[PDB]
Amino acid sequence: PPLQAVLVADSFDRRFFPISKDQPRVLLPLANVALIDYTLEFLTATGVQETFVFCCWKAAQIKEHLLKSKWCRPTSLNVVRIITSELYRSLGDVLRDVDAKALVRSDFLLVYGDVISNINITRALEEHRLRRKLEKNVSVMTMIFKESSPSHPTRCHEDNVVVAVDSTTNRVLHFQKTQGLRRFAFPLSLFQGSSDGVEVRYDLLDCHISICSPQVAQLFTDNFDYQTRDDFVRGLLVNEEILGNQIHMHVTAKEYGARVSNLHMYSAVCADVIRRWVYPLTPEANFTDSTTQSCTHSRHNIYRGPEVSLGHGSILEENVLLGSGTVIGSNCFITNSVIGPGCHIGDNVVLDQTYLWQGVRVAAGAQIHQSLLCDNAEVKERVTLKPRSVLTSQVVVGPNITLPEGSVISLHPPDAEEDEDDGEFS
């Protein structure tokens, strides 16, 4: 049997504002590569034969981004199916359009458009297939989690997930989040339903690559109130007397899998991709065929593109990526940051955990720490930036104007904190 997959390339949460107001969150570059290309490379490394990309907001931009990619070529082993409609605005709507179109056949994969992973789940696929073969289509969904620590900077407090599963046949009994909860309550029927073994797990990072039967599309057509994945699981776990449909679980301890939801997950997944945690998906490996992203890997995870023309006194000590055509001046100090292609950096500048995209221009004497600079940006001289400062789509920051810690600037007034110009004062 073939291996189908659906890819929700439109995250329906209003989190990347006003970053997603210009280009969507699945087209942002981690290290000069959009997350669509990362997820599609993960899908071809898995071994799928055909995918179904679903995109609603700015879907023409996603379409023109991925038609010129490696996966739309006729020599690609994994074909794609671009499906465009502005009617759906939820993952359950995507799955009920899948059920209405009858695209999938048996044991299809479910992934978001912003999932970074390198897990081979053929073992979990065979486990799901044997669990469907013995119990006669009782197991419907196999969620996938990664072994992680609760104090890790990858999983934040907004996306921490605590489950309660079985120990010997790993079926999920309870599943919830910690969104503003200091004390957790678990039901009592999970012990009466299974007197053989039960374990509460908080060490599980969610990667949202939960493979599933085509019966979840049927259950989404029946229950219209199920909006997304987590309330669907929370409703299936409490409705066990009718339509039981036990959800099983797989854990990964040697492979990486995560997604993005805000600037914190973006920063953590970018720092993990730069530190080669998602190997083989590596920036110098060039998994997509493009000449503008070919790179070389020196010591201390220093990634250097072509035609950089590095200056005297510049220090690159740890976890530095430089795009193609990035102009770097003298006496710089860059660490734990990614720089886009075609940038211009001044003199006596520091870069601490920043994320600079293509087309930016940083003048001399600028102090940038833990920021995010989007496309075609401009930064003047004598400026000091604070952590968690976002500027999107060619925001110019005037001279002698420091920004606070919480400060997001864009061209849209009510979505961002303010709008900038050649002078930062209004």
Partner 1 sequence: LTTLDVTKLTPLSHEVISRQATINIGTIGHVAHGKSTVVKAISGVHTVRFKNELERNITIKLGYANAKIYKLNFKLVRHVSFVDCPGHDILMATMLNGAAVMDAALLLIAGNESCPQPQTSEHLAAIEIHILILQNKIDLVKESQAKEQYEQILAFVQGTVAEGAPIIPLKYNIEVVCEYIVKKIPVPPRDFTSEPRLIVIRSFDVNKPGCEVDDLKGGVAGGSILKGVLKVGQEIEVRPGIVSKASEGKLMCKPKFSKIVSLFAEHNDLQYAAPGGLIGVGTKIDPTLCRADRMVGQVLGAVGALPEIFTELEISYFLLRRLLGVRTEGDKKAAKVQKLSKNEVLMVNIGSLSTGGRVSAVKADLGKIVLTNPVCTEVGEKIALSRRVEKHWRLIGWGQIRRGVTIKPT
Partner 2 sequence: GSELSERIESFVETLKRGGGPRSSEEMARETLGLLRQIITDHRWSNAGELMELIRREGRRMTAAQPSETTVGNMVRRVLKIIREEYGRLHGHYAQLQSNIIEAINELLVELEGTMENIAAQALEHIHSNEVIMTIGFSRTVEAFLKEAARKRKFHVIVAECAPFCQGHEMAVNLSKAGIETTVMTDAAIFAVMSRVNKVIIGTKTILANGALRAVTGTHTLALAAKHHSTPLIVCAPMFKLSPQFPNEEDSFHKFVAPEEVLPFTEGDILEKVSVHCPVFDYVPPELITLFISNIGGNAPSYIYRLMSELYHPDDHVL
Partner 3 sequence: MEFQAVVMAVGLPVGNKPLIWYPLNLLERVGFEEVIVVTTRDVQKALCAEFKMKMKPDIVCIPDDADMGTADSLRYIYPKLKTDVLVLSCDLITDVALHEVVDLFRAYDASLAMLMRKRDFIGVDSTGKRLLFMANEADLDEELVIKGSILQKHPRIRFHTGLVDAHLYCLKKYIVDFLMENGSITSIRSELIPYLVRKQFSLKSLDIYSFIKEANTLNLAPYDACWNACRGDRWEDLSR
Radius of gyration of the chain (CA): 23
Nearest distance from C-beta of residue 218 to partner 1, angstroms: 6
Measured CA to CA in angstroms, residue 231 lies from 56, 76, 293 at distances of 22, 36, 40
Contacts of 225 (CB under 8 A, 6+ apart): 235
* Interface with partner 2 in residues 297-316 (CB under 8 A): 297-298, 300-301
- CB neighbours (10 Å) of residue 365? 16
Among 274, 242, 240, 239, residue whose Cα is nearest residue 256: 274
Q: Which is nearer to partner 3, 136 or 182 (CB)?
A: 182
Q: Specify whether the CB–CB gap between 249 and 163 falls below 8 A.
A: yes
Per DSSP, 293 falls in state G
- Take residue 243 and report the two structure tokens written for it: 């339509």
- CB neighbours (10 Å) of residue 202? 15
Distance CA 109, CA 1 (A): 13
Applying CB under 8 A, the site for partner 2 has a residue count of 37
Residue 87 binds partner 1 (CB under 8 A) = yes
Stretch in the footprint of partner 1 (CB under 8 A) among 150-158, 219-227, 257-265, 289-297: 219-227
Distance CA 213, CA 171 (A): 15
Residue 77 binds partner 3 (CB under 8 A) = no
Q: Which is nearer to partner 3, 168 or 426 (CB)?
A: 168
Nearest distance from C-beta of residue 193 to partner 3, angstroms: 11
Residue 167 binds partner 3 (CB under 8 A) = yes
Nearest distance from C-beta of residue 154 to partner 1, angstroms: 31
- Take residue 140 and report the two structure tokens written for it: 């419907």
From candidates 127, 158, 240, 284, binder to partner 2 by CB under 8 A:
284
Stretch in the footprint of partner 2 (CB under 8 A) among 93-101, 122-130, 271-279, 370-378: 271-279
Q: Specify whether the CB–CB gap between 101 and 223 falls below 8 A.
A: no
Contacts of 195 (CB under 8 A, 6+ apart): none
From candidates 201, 344, 386, 388, binder to partner 3 by CB under 8 A:
201
Among 190, 175, 35, 221, residue whose Cα is nearest residue 111: 35
Stretch in the footprint of partner 2 (CB under 8 A) among 174-182, 268-276, 337-345, 375-383: 268-276
From candidates 130, 285, 400, 406, binder to partner 2 by CB under 8 A:
285
**Which runs of consecutive H residues, i.e. helices, occur in 239-319?**
263-274
Nearest distance from C-beta of residue 328 to partner 1, angstroms: 45
Residue 153 binds partner 3 (CB under 8 A) = no
Which stretches of the chain bind partner 1, using CB under 8 A?
A: 84-87, 93, 96-97, 100, 102, 218, 222, 224-225, 235, 238-239, 242-243
Which stretches of the chain bind partner 2, using CB under 8 A?
A: 44-45, 75-77, 118, 146-149, 151-153, 203, 253-256, 268, 271, 275-280, 284-287, 296-298, 300-301, 318-319
Which stretches of the chain bind partner 3, using CB under 8 A?
A: 149-151, 162, 167, 178, 181-188, 191, 195, 197-203
